[PDB]
């Protein structure tokens, strides 16, 4: 799966680097301007992604929860390329999509559209307080003190601490989270009516 993931990452990287409408590389300029003001994101329009290479859009719209983290990785790599002098510690960039697809009524979201990308309208009636979802999860083995790391994508498929000492038995669940070395992001729950 490494080869396909790398191919997808490289394809969307080339989309970031090469796309331009008329004399201006829209997404290179947007990425640089976003980095300058410490806005680690990239608002990617969907018509542009369709026009560039419709195969990429097909791959994205097929399994969004598996492709979008790859696109965020590609955005991060492009950001390092165009904002860091070769020879880090740059957060994984966030992909913000803009679409003009037909709006699906909120009551029409049924068994189909599950795991699909849907565009819909409503009125917010509640906003939760900010939570904290971990992205970098520094972790240490309880018995043998085998410190490692876990990286979280936050796009739930449909991950947990390893159930192994992963390098005497150390038990079934030998891992405790090191909270002074982890990195978190804020998450908010809405409620659409």
């Amino acid at each position: 799966n490494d080869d396909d993931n790398t191919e997808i990452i490289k394809s969307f990287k080339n989309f970031i680097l090469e796309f331009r409408l008329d004399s201006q590389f829209i997404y290179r300029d947007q990425l640089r301007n976003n980095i300058l003001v410490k806005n680690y994101s990239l608002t990617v329009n969907m018509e542009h992604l369709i026009g560039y290479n419709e195969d990429i859009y097909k791959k994205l719209s097929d399994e969004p929860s598996d492709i979008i983290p790859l696109f965020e990785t590609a955005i991060t790599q492009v950001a390092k390329r165009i904002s860091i002098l070769s020879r880090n510690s740059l957060p994984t960039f966030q992909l913000i999509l803009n679409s003009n697809a037909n709006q699906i009524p909120l009551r029409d979201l049924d068994s189909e559209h599950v795991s699909k990308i849907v565009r819909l309208s409503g009125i917010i009636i509640s906003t939760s307080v900010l939570s904290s979802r971990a992205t970098y999860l520094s972790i240490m083995c309880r018995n043998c003190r085998h410190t490692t790391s876990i990286t979280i994508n936050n796009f739930n498929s449909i991950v947990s601490l390893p159930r192994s000492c992963l390098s005497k038995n150390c038990g079934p669940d030998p891992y405790i989270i090191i909270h002074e070395s982890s990195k978190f992001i804020d998450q908010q729950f809405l409620k659409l009516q």
Binding site: L36, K38, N45
Partner: protein, 173 residues
């Protein structure tokens, strides 16, 4: 420090805390007692264009006290996080007044702090000025940082941003 510079004119007209040194007669026209004179060792707030002259001519008539905007609290705030300091609320003309104070008192330590403050804030305002919005069809951080600039930095930012915008508009025409 031009004569007709409105920024300098407005900077001159800022009240400053200054105590008196003489039991001067007949003054105080608008100082709460027109006819009645001003007592010695009286603390009064005077415009800079007046206190500057009154603190050199004469023992000088008026002794200038350290203003709050250059107090050790503000100095510590400057030395801690220069970028995230709301210098517009401290004084809308902070840099001009700091330059005037250094010129008056030859303060080699206030200057060494305000220059570093200016450099550190110039980095960030260049970052904000050179980042131009692109329409696919203003940022929150840019707008929340532009509220914390004095009348001097608000002009450097305007000039540099206009230059960057003109270059972008020409290149991509």
């Amino acid at each position: 420090m031009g004569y007709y510079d409105i920024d300098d004119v407005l900077a001159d007209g800022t009240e400053f805390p200054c105590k008196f040194q003489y039991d001067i007669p007949g003054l105080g026209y608008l100082e709460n007692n027109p006819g009645r004179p001003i007592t010695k060792n009286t603390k009064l707030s005077l415009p800079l264009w007046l206190a500057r002259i009154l603190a050199i001519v004469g023992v000088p008539f008026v002794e200038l006290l350290p203003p709050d905007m250059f107090s050790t609290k503000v100095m510590n705030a400057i030395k801690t996080d220069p970028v995230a300091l709301d210098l517009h609320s401290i004084n809308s003309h902070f840099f001009s007044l700091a330059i005037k104070w250094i010129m008056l008192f030859s303060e080699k330590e206030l200057a060494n702090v305000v220059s570093e403050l200016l450099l550190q804030r110039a980095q960030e305002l260049n970052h904000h000025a050179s980042s131009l919005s692109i329409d696919l069809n203003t940022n929150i951080a840019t707008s929340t940082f532009l509220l914390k600039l004095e009348e001097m930095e608000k002009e450097i930012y305007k000039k540099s941003h206009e230059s960057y915008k003109d270059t972008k508009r020409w290149m991509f025409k």
